[PDB]
Structure formats: structure tokens, C-alpha cells
């Protein structure tokens, strides 16, 4: 897709990852963070910050720290929305 659609899908999935994370839905946050990341990579400086945070969100999620994965996914949205 073009840049716009990828950024949009990256934001939407990151929003859904955040929403899952606040509910403690670790695997669902992971599923969406990974979809967000695929789109953010396909959209590829705002985007690069978003990618870094999504990668961090996935690492922390895989580590059982869904609060920390959530915050990183929120940070990714801020950056992706910047872009
Ligand atoms: Ni594309």
C-alpha cells in the first residue's frame, strides 16, 4: 500500500495493541504490535521512532511486562501520528 495507508494501519494496530495492553491482553498486544510493525516498516524519522518503540513493545510483551509494552506502544502511536 502507499505510505498513508501503512501509517494508518500501523496506528490502528498500535491503538488496538495499547487497548489490549491496558486490559492485560499480552498475546493480543503482541499480535497487534507485530502487525503495526510490519506496516510501519512498509511505510518507511517519525516512522523510525515508531518502529523502535514497536520493537521495544514486542520485546517487553514477550518479557511479561505488558504495562511496559503498552507504554512503548503508546509512544509508537505518538510518533506514527507525527508522521
Ligand atoms: Ni505498501
Short mmCIF file of N, CA and C and ligand atoms in Angstrom, two decimals:
data_model
loop_
_atom_site.label_atom_id
_atom_site.label_comp_id
_atom_site.label_asym_id
_atom_site.label_seq_id
_atom_site.Cartn_x
_atom_site.Cartn_y
_atom_site.Cartn_z
N UNK A 1 0.91 -1.22 0.00
CA UNK A 1 0.00 0.00 0.00
C UNK A 1 0.91 1.22 0.00
N UNK A 2 0.35 2.42 -0.13
CA UNK A 2 1.20 3.58 -0.03
C UNK A 2 1.49 3.95 1.39
N UNK A 3 2.29 4.99 1.56
CA UNK A 3 2.76 5.44 2.88
C UNK A 3 1.56 5.72 3.77
N UNK A 4 0.55 6.39 3.22
CA UNK A 4 -0.58 6.83 4.06
C UNK A 4 -1.29 5.65 4.66
N UNK A 5 -1.55 4.66 3.82
CA UNK A 5 -2.33 3.54 4.27
C UNK A 5 -1.51 2.73 5.27
N UNK A 6 -0.21 2.59 5.04
CA UNK A 6 0.61 1.87 6.02
C UNK A 6 0.70 2.57 7.36
N UNK A 7 0.90 3.87 7.33
CA UNK A 7 0.95 4.60 8.59
C UNK A 7 -0.40 4.42 9.27
N UNK A 8 -1.50 4.53 8.51
CA UNK A 8 -2.83 4.39 9.11
C UNK A 8 -3.02 3.04 9.75
N UNK A 9 -2.66 1.97 9.02
CA UNK A 9 -2.80 0.64 9.57
C UNK A 9 -1.83 0.48 10.76
N UNK A 10 -0.63 1.06 10.68
CA UNK A 10 0.31 0.94 11.83
C UNK A 10 -0.30 1.59 13.11
N UNK A 11 -0.88 2.77 12.93
CA UNK A 11 -1.52 3.49 14.06
C UNK A 11 -2.70 2.68 14.62
N UNK A 12 -3.56 2.20 13.73
CA UNK A 12 -4.72 1.46 14.14
C UNK A 12 -4.35 0.20 14.90
N UNK A 13 -3.35 -0.53 14.41
CA UNK A 13 -2.96 -1.70 15.12
C UNK A 13 -2.26 -1.39 16.44
N UNK A 14 -1.47 -0.33 16.44
CA UNK A 14 -0.79 0.07 17.67
C UNK A 14 -1.88 0.50 18.66
N UNK A 15 -2.92 1.21 18.16
CA UNK A 15 -4.03 1.56 19.11
C UNK A 15 -4.70 0.36 19.70
N UNK A 16 -4.92 -0.68 18.88
CA UNK A 16 -5.52 -1.87 19.38
C UNK A 16 -4.54 -2.58 20.31
N UNK A 17 -3.23 -2.61 19.99
CA UNK A 17 -2.28 -3.19 20.93
C UNK A 17 -2.35 -2.47 22.31
N UNK A 18 -2.37 -1.14 22.30
CA UNK A 18 -2.46 -0.38 23.58
C UNK A 18 -3.74 -0.78 24.35
N UNK A 19 -4.87 -0.81 23.64
CA UNK A 19 -6.11 -1.12 24.29
C UNK A 19 -6.06 -2.54 24.95
N UNK A 20 -5.48 -3.50 24.22
CA UNK A 20 -5.31 -4.88 24.78
C UNK A 20 -4.41 -4.85 26.00
N UNK A 21 -3.39 -4.01 25.93
CA UNK A 21 -2.33 -3.98 26.97
C UNK A 21 -2.89 -3.46 28.24
N UNK A 22 -3.75 -2.43 28.14
CA UNK A 22 -4.40 -1.88 29.30
C UNK A 22 -5.33 -2.89 29.95
N UNK A 23 -5.77 -3.90 29.19
CA UNK A 23 -6.59 -4.96 29.70
C UNK A 23 -5.74 -6.13 30.12
N UNK A 24 -4.44 -5.99 29.96
CA UNK A 24 -3.50 -7.09 30.31
C UNK A 24 -3.53 -8.25 29.29
N UNK A 25 -4.03 -7.99 28.08
CA UNK A 25 -4.07 -8.99 27.00
C UNK A 25 -2.74 -9.09 26.28
N UNK A 26 -1.75 -9.71 26.93
CA UNK A 26 -0.39 -9.68 26.39
C UNK A 26 -0.27 -10.24 24.98
N UNK A 27 -0.86 -11.39 24.71
CA UNK A 27 -0.68 -12.03 23.41
C UNK A 27 -1.32 -11.22 22.30
N UNK A 28 -2.48 -10.62 22.60
CA UNK A 28 -3.18 -9.76 21.64
C UNK A 28 -2.44 -8.43 21.42
N UNK A 29 -1.85 -7.85 22.49
CA UNK A 29 -0.98 -6.70 22.29
C UNK A 29 0.14 -7.12 21.34
N UNK A 30 0.70 -8.30 21.56
CA UNK A 30 1.84 -8.75 20.73
C UNK A 30 1.39 -8.90 19.28
N UNK A 31 0.22 -9.51 19.09
CA UNK A 31 -0.27 -9.77 17.74
C UNK A 31 -0.39 -8.45 16.99
N UNK A 32 -1.03 -7.47 17.62
CA UNK A 32 -1.17 -6.13 17.00
C UNK A 32 0.06 -5.30 16.87
N UNK A 33 0.97 -5.34 17.87
CA UNK A 33 2.25 -4.65 17.80
C UNK A 33 3.01 -5.22 16.58
N UNK A 34 2.94 -6.55 16.39
CA UNK A 34 3.68 -7.11 15.26
C UNK A 34 3.08 -6.69 13.89
N UNK A 35 1.75 -6.62 13.79
CA UNK A 35 1.09 -6.13 12.59
C UNK A 35 1.44 -4.67 12.40
N UNK A 36 1.35 -3.87 13.48
CA UNK A 36 1.73 -2.46 13.41
C UNK A 36 3.12 -2.30 12.85
N UNK A 37 4.02 -3.13 13.34
CA UNK A 37 5.44 -3.06 12.93
C UNK A 37 5.67 -3.40 11.47
N UNK A 38 4.93 -4.40 11.01
CA UNK A 38 5.02 -4.74 9.58
C UNK A 38 4.63 -3.55 8.74
N UNK A 39 3.53 -2.91 9.12
CA UNK A 39 3.07 -1.72 8.37
C UNK A 39 4.01 -0.54 8.54
N UNK A 40 4.52 -0.31 9.73
CA UNK A 40 5.44 0.78 9.96
C UNK A 40 6.70 0.59 9.13
N UNK A 41 7.21 -0.65 9.06
CA UNK A 41 8.36 -0.91 8.20
C UNK A 41 8.02 -0.69 6.72
N UNK A 42 6.81 -1.08 6.32
CA UNK A 42 6.37 -0.89 4.93
C UNK A 42 6.20 0.65 4.62
N UNK A 43 5.93 1.44 5.65
CA UNK A 43 5.78 2.91 5.49
C UNK A 43 7.14 3.57 5.39
N UNK A 44 8.15 3.00 6.05
CA UNK A 44 9.49 3.56 5.93
C UNK A 44 9.80 3.70 4.45
N UNK A 45 11.53 10.23 9.84
CA UNK A 45 12.17 9.91 11.12
C UNK A 45 11.15 9.53 12.18
N UNK A 46 9.94 10.08 12.08
CA UNK A 46 8.82 9.75 12.96
C UNK A 46 8.58 8.25 12.86
N UNK A 47 8.59 7.74 11.62
CA UNK A 47 8.29 6.34 11.40
C UNK A 47 9.37 5.51 12.06
N UNK A 48 10.62 5.95 11.94
CA UNK A 48 11.73 5.21 12.54
C UNK A 48 11.64 5.17 14.04
N UNK A 49 11.24 6.27 14.67
CA UNK A 49 10.95 6.24 16.12
C UNK A 49 9.82 5.31 16.46
N UNK A 50 8.75 5.33 15.66
CA UNK A 50 7.63 4.40 15.84
C UNK A 50 8.11 2.95 15.78
N UNK A 51 8.90 2.61 14.78
CA UNK A 51 9.45 1.25 14.63
C UNK A 51 10.23 0.79 15.89
N UNK A 52 11.07 1.69 16.42
CA UNK A 52 11.92 1.41 17.59
C UNK A 52 11.03 1.11 18.76
N UNK A 53 10.00 1.92 18.96
CA UNK A 53 9.09 1.69 20.07
C UNK A 53 8.28 0.41 19.91
N UNK A 54 7.81 0.13 18.70
CA UNK A 54 7.09 -1.12 18.46
C UNK A 54 7.97 -2.31 18.75
N UNK A 55 9.23 -2.23 18.39
CA UNK A 55 10.16 -3.36 18.62
C UNK A 55 10.33 -3.53 20.13
N UNK A 56 10.47 -2.41 20.83
CA UNK A 56 10.55 -2.42 22.28
C UNK A 56 9.28 -2.93 22.89
N UNK A 57 8.12 -2.55 22.36
CA UNK A 57 6.85 -3.05 22.89
C UNK A 57 6.81 -4.58 22.75
N UNK A 58 7.26 -5.08 21.63
CA UNK A 58 7.22 -6.55 21.43
C UNK A 58 8.16 -7.23 22.39
N UNK A 59 9.36 -6.67 22.55
CA UNK A 59 10.33 -7.31 23.47
C UNK A 59 9.76 -7.37 24.91
N UNK A 60 9.23 -6.27 25.40
CA UNK A 60 8.70 -6.23 26.72
C UNK A 60 7.48 -7.10 26.91
N UNK A 61 6.58 -7.07 25.93
CA UNK A 61 5.49 -8.02 25.91
C UNK A 61 5.93 -9.49 25.98
N UNK A 62 6.92 -9.83 25.16
CA UNK A 62 7.43 -11.17 25.19
C UNK A 62 8.04 -11.49 26.57
N UNK A 63 8.56 -10.46 27.26
CA UNK A 63 9.03 -10.48 28.66
C UNK A 63 8.01 -10.43 29.81
N UNK A 64 6.75 -10.29 29.50
CA UNK A 64 5.71 -10.39 30.52
C UNK A 64 5.41 -9.06 31.18
N UNK A 65 5.90 -7.98 30.59
CA UNK A 65 5.71 -6.66 31.15
C UNK A 65 4.82 -5.92 30.22
N UNK A 66 3.54 -6.22 30.33
CA UNK A 66 2.56 -5.65 29.45
C UNK A 66 2.33 -4.16 29.71
N UNK A 67 2.53 -3.69 30.94
CA UNK A 67 2.44 -2.26 31.19
C UNK A 67 3.52 -1.58 30.35
N UNK A 68 4.72 -2.18 30.37
CA UNK A 68 5.86 -1.50 29.73
C UNK A 68 5.68 -1.61 28.20
N UNK A 69 5.22 -2.77 27.74
CA UNK A 69 4.90 -2.92 26.31
C UNK A 69 3.82 -1.92 25.88
N UNK A 70 2.82 -1.66 26.72
CA UNK A 70 1.73 -0.68 26.44
C UNK A 70 2.27 0.75 26.25
N UNK A 71 3.13 1.17 27.18
CA UNK A 71 3.69 2.48 27.18
C UNK A 71 4.50 2.59 25.88
N UNK A 72 5.23 1.55 25.52
CA UNK A 72 6.06 1.71 24.30
C UNK A 72 5.15 1.79 23.09
N UNK A 73 4.07 1.01 23.09
CA UNK A 73 3.09 1.11 22.01
C UNK A 73 2.41 2.49 21.99
N UNK A 74 2.06 3.06 23.14
CA UNK A 74 1.59 4.45 23.13
C UNK A 74 2.62 5.41 22.50
N UNK A 75 3.90 5.27 22.87
CA UNK A 75 4.97 6.11 22.30
C UNK A 75 5.06 5.91 20.79
N UNK A 76 4.93 4.67 20.32
CA UNK A 76 4.93 4.41 18.88
C UNK A 76 3.78 5.17 18.19
N UNK A 77 2.59 5.17 18.76
CA UNK A 77 1.47 5.90 18.18
C UNK A 77 1.78 7.36 18.06
N UNK A 78 2.31 7.97 19.13
CA UNK A 78 2.65 9.40 19.09
C UNK A 78 3.53 9.73 17.87
N UNK A 79 4.55 8.90 17.66
CA UNK A 79 5.48 9.11 16.60
C UNK A 79 4.82 8.83 15.26
N UNK A 80 4.12 7.72 15.14
CA UNK A 80 3.47 7.43 13.88
C UNK A 80 2.48 8.52 13.52
N UNK A 81 1.78 9.07 14.51
CA UNK A 81 0.81 10.14 14.25
C UNK A 81 1.51 11.41 13.84
N UNK A 82 2.67 11.68 14.44
CA UNK A 82 3.53 12.76 13.98
C UNK A 82 3.78 12.68 12.46
N UNK A 83 3.92 11.46 11.94
CA UNK A 83 4.34 11.22 10.54
C UNK A 83 3.20 11.16 9.52
NI1 LIG B 1 2.67 -0.95 0.62
#
